[PDB]
Amino acid sequence: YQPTPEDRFTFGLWTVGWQGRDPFGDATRRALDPVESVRRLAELGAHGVTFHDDDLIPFGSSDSEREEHVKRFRQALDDTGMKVPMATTNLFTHPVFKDGGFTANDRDVRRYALRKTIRNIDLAVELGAETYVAWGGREGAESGGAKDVRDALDRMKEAFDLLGEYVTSQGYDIRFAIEPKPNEPRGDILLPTVGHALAFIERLERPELYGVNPEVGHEQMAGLNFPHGIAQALWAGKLFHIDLNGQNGIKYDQDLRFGAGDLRAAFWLVDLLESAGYSGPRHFDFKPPRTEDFDGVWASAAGCMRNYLILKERAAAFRADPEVQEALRASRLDELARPTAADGLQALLDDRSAFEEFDVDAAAARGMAFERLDQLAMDHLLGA
Amino acid sequence: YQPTPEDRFTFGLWTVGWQGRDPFGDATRRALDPVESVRRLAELGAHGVTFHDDDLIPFGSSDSEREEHVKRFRQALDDTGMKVPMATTNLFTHPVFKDGGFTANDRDVRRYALRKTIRNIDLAVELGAETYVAWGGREGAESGGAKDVRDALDRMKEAFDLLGEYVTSQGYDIRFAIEPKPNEPRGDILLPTVGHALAFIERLERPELYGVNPEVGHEQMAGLNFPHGIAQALWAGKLFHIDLNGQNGIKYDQDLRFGAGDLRAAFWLVDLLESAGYSGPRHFDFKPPRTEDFDGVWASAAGCMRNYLILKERAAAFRADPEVQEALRASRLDELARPTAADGLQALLDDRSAFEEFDVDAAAARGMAFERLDQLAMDHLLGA
C-alpha cells in the first residue's frame, strides 16, 4: 500500500502546516516553510500540493517578498517533481472578511474580495493549476436580519460571473470548483451542501466553467451521505475536485485523516470514485491533530494515502468477486440500470402488466437480498 | 388572529386524519372520514385540503367504490367552499414500494409507480389541483451496495420526464413540486435537501414544469436553515408549494404544529414568505400528537393557523418599524442589495480603491451592528 506520485495524491499546504490553534487553544506546532512541506510530502509519495494565496505569500507582502516566496516554492517543486493542481483564495481569516468576501454586506469588501481572488488566479495559472476552489466560509449569518439571502445570492452570482469573465478574457484553461460547507465559522453558510452548490451553478452565466469541490466531512456535518452526494455530482458532470478526510458525525469540522471517521462511507466513496473513473487529484484536506508533533504530522499524512489504497484494493476485490456479482443480480442492481420505459409513454399507458394485471403482492413478497450483499461488502472491507 | 379562507391555509387529509400509529405504538384515534375533515377544517377557517390517492380512495377500490368516495368528497367541498389545490401519490405505504417507486430496483415496480401516479394526476386535475407533489420517501438505501445512485437518478429523471410528457400530452396546467427529505424511512433518501432537488430539476427535459415543495422539518432534520433554503428556492423561481410544521432539531420527523419547534426560524420564514409575496397555499403537513383525542386534533390544526397569523403580524411590525429600518441601514442591508460591480470587470480591475488603496483595517474595524438588529427582531417577535 505504498503510494507513488501516479496515484495523484495531493495535500493543501494548510493541512500538514496547521499549527494546531483551535477555538480554545494556542498553537502546538511551529509554522512550516512551504518548501519543507513540499519536500516531506514528496518523500511520502504525494504527487502535488495546493495553496491559498496567504499560505504561500504572507498577507501584506511587498512585491519583492512575493517574488522571493514564489521563487523558493518553484525551486522545491522543481527539486521534487511535485505539481500544483489547484489553488484557492483566503477570504476568511482577515477581520475585513468577518461578514463575508463575495457576499459581505459592505460593497467595498466585496470588490476587494474579487480583486484578491483575481490576483491569485493569475498566480495559480503561473504555477500550473487546473482548478481554482472557492470556499465561502464567511458567507452566511448568525441571525436572520443580518443577511437577505436572495440579495446575497445575487452578489454571489455576480462575483462568480465576473471571475468567469476574467478567466475567459485572459484565455485561461482553469475551471472553478465551489466547496460547500453547512456551518462553521458562520452560524449557517450559504450553499451549505453539494446540492445547493450544484443548483446555484446552473444560474451562472457560463455554467460549464464551474463545478463542485465536495468535502467528506462537510456533507457529514449535515448528516448527509457523502457517497450519495458525490454520485449526484458525477451524474451532473460537475465533480471537478474533491477533498478527502474524516469526520465523526454532526459536530464541528474535525478534518480527521482520510479513513478515520466513517470508515464504511470511506469504502463506498473509494468504490464510487474508482468505478466512475474519477480522474482528478485525490486531495486531502485534513488536520493532523494538535496532540501531534511533526513526526506525527507526517505519519497522519502517510495514513491518508495508505487508507485510500487499502480501500481501493478492498472495493476492487468486492466488485470483481463472482459471488458479489451474483448477489448484485439477486438484488436487481442490473434491473436498476435498465430504462423504466424505453417503449415510451403510450406503450406504458397501454401495458396492462404495469397496472391492471400487475400482481403487487407477488412483487412485494420478493426480498431484495440487500443484507447478504452488504455482508459480502463487509467481509471484503475487513478481508474476512 | 382568526383565519379566514382568504389566508389560503390548507391541510393534508393525512394530517388531521393521522391515527397515531408510530414505530413503537398502535393507533390512538379512529380513522376520519374525509368528509368530516373537510367540514371541521372549514369551520376552523381553512381554505382547502390536499390528498394522497390512498387517503381519498382506499387502496384496491373498485370503480364503483372509487366513484362513491369521490362523489362524497366533492359534496363536502361544495357544501363548504373548500378547494383542493394540491394532490400527491402514495408511493411509500404498500410493501411493493419497499425499495422505492420511481427508483425501485425492480423495473416492474417502477412502471407500476408511474401508472399509479398518472391515474391520480387525472383525478387531481378533475378536483381542481394546480400542483402535484412527489415525495420519494422510499427512494434510497440502508446500505451502500443496494442502490447505484447514478443509475437511480437516471431512473428518477426518466420517471419525471414521462410525467411531464403525460401532462403536456393532456394539455393539463398542473405543475410538479418535488419534496425533499434527508432520511426516514430509508437510511438515506435521494434528493435529500432543497438544494439537491433544485439541482436535479435542471436536468429534466422540461424544467419549467417542476419546482420544490420544501418542508420546515425536513430541512431541519439535516440541521439546515429553512429560511435560507426557501430563499434559494425563491431566488431560483422554484417555490411551487411549501409544507409548514415544526421540528426540534436533528431527529426523527416530528411534524409538530407550525410555530412549535424552532420558533425563531418560523418567524424568519413568515417574514420571508410575506416579503417575497409568495402566492401559494400556506399548507400544513403536521401530525397532531398521538397523546391527543379529536378535540386536540382540531385544537392543533387551529394553532397552526394562529401561529402563522401572529408571526405575520410581528414580522410586518418589524419591517415597518422606523427604528428597524435605521438598524438595517446601519448593518448595510441596503448595500448588500446593490451590485458589486455594475461598472464592469475592467473598471473593477482599474479601480485602485478596490485593492491597492483599500484600507482593509478601517473596513475591518466597522462593526456590523447585527446584535442590535437581532434584539429589535426579538423584541418585535415577543411584543416587548
Added chain:
Amino acid sequence: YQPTPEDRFTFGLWTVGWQGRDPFGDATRRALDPVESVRRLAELGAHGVTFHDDDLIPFGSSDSEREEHVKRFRQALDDTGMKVPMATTNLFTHPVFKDGGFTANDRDVRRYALRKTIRNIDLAVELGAETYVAWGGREGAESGGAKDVRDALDRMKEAFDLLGEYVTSQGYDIRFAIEPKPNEPRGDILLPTVGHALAFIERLERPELYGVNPEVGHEQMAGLNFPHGIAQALWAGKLFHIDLNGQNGIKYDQDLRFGAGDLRAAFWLVDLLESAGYSGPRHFDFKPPRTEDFDGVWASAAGCMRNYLILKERAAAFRADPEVQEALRASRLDELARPTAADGLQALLDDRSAFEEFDVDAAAARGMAFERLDQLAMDHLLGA
C-alpha cells in the same frame, strides 16, 4: 468466524420477528411464531433469546392461552438448548401508554404499568432470566408544559423502588437494567443517555439492584461515543446488559445489524468488552430491514454474530501486537493508568517539580504519537 452457543449471543424475539411496519409503511413480512425463531436462531449458533411479555403472550390472552404459549416456547427451548437470560415489559405499544407507563400523568395508568411489569417478572424468573430490562420509551414529552420532569422522576423512582421491593419480597435473584434512549417515540425521553440513567440509579432505595442496558444506536442518536459511555458504565460497576446494533448518526433509531453503522466504534466497543472481561450476554437489538424476506432476516442475524467475532479477532490482534504495545507506551497509556498523586496532597503541594520548576514548554513539545497508534489500529481492523 462461526458462532457457537458459548459466545453467549442472544436476540430479542422482536428483532428477527419484526414484521417491517415503520412510520410510513405496512408490514413486509408475516409474523413469526416464537418457536420458529428459537429454532432458527439455535441453528445459527445463538445461545439464547429475550422477550417482552407481549411478544410471547398476545396482549389480552386468557390464562389457558397464556399457559399454552409458554408451554410451546418452553418446548422449543428444551429442544434446542436455548436460554432466556433477559426479559422486559411492553409499556409502549398499547394506546393506554401514550403518555408513559411509570411516568404517565394518569395515576391509574402508572399503577397498571407496575402490575403488568410485576406479572412478567414472575414469568421471567420461571424461564430463568437473570436480568429484567426497563425501556421507558413513552416516558417524556413533545411539549414543555405536559410533563413536570421533577414530578416525573419522583414517579419513576417510586416505580423502580416498588419493583425492587417486589423482587426482594419474593427472594428473586433477578436484577434490573435501565435502557436509555434520547428521543423516539417521544420528542424527548426521560433518562436520555447512559449518564442520566446511572445518575438516577444512585437515588433509588436499593441501588445495587439496578444497572444500565446501553444500546449502541441510542447513544449515537445523541452523537455520543458509545465506547466511552460503556467505559463509564463499567467504571461504575453498572453494565448489567448491553444491546448491540448499528446506527448511522443522528437520526431515527435504525437498529441496523451489529457491525453496520459506525464500524470503527464497533471495533473499539468489542475491544473494550473483551479487555474488561464483560461477562453478560452479547445481545442484539436489531431490525432486519423491511426490504428483506425471511431468508434475509436470518442472514442479517448471522451477520450480527459474524461481525462481532471478526472484530474480536482484530481487537485481540491489536492488543497482542508488540508494535502496538510499544506504541501504547510511546503515547503514555501506561502513565494514564498510574495514580496522579499517591504521595498525597501535601507532598504534591510541596513538590516544586509540579509547578514552580515544571518546564511546561518541554512537556508541551512532546508529541502524543496518537496518529501512529491509531493507524496501527486501522491496519489491524482491516487486516492490512
Added chain:
Amino acid sequence: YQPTPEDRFTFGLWTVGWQGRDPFGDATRRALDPVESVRRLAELGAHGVTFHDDDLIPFGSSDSEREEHVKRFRQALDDTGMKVPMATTNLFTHPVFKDGGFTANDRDVRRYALRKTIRNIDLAVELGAETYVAWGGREGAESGGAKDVRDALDRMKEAFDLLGEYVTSQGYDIRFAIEPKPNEPRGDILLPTVGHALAFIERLERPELYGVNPEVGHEQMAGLNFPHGIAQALWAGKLFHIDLNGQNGIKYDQDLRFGAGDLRAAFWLVDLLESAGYSGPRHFDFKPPRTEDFDGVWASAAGCMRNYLILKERAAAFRADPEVQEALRASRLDELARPTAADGLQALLDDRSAFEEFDVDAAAARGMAFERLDQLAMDHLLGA
C-alpha cells in the same frame, strides 16, 4: 425589562472580552482590560463577574504583576459594587494541556493541572467566590486507542478528590461545579452531559462538595433537552451554577446571547428556574459575534439580561393564568405530582382496579389535552 444587580446577572470576563478569534479567523476586537469590563457590565445592571485564572492574571506573570492585576480588579469591584461569585481554571489554552489537564496521559501534566487549580482556588476565595467551576474541555480523545476511559475516570476522580481534600484542609466554604460538554475541542469529551457528570459525582469521596454547571448550548450540542437536564439536576440537589446562552442545534459551540437559539427552550428553562426557586447567579457564558464592534458587545450583553427578564414575565403570566391552571388540571399535571402507590406494594398487588378490572380502553381514549396547553404557553410567550 431593566435589570438591576438584584436579578443576580453575572458574566465571565472571557465573554464580553472575547476578541473574536475562531478556527478560521483572526481577532476582530482588541483585548479588554478587566477593569473596563467590570465598569461597563455594572453600568448595564449586572451583579457580578467570573474569571479564569488566565483572564485576570496573564499566564506566566511575576508575583508583583499578579498583585498589581488583582489590585486593579479589586478597585473596580469596589468602585461598582460588583461581586465575583464564581471562578475557574484555564486548563485548555496552553499547549501543555493538549491531551488534558486532570486526565492528561502524562502524569507530570496532571500534577501541574492540580497545582494550577489549587493556586486559583486560593485567589477565588480571596475574591469572595462561592463556586469553583471545572470544565474539562481537553479531557477526551480523537481516537479510540489514545485514552483508556476507565483509567481516565480514575484520574479524574483522584483529581477531584484531591481538590476536595484541599478545600476541606483550608476550611473554605467553596463548592465545585463540573461543567459538561459533549465535544469540541476534543473529538469526544469525558463527562459529556449533565447525566454523566451527575453520575460521576456520586463516586467522589465527598459528593456533597460537587454539583454541576450545565450550559444551555452544551446539552443542545448533543440534541438533548436542556430544561429536562436542569430538572434532573434540581431533582438530585446538584444545580450549583448554570451557564446561560443560545445554540442553534447540533453543531459547533456557538455561545449566542441568551434568548437566541432555541427560544422556546429558553422560555421553559426560565419557567423551571423561577418555579424551582433557583437561587444561584444567572450567569451568561456567551460570545458577542465577531461581526460586532465594542458597541455591539455591550448591546449583546444587555440583550442577555433583557431576554431573561422578558421570559420571566411571560412564564410567570403563564403559570398565574387561571385558564392555564385549568388546562394543567385537564392534562393531569396534578395527578403526575401524586404518589403512584402511597398505599404500598401489597395494596397495589391486591388492588383489582389496577389490573384485573382496569378498563384500559377507557383510559386510552382519554386525550391528554397537551396541544391546548401548549398553545396557551405559546400565546403567553408571544404576548398574544
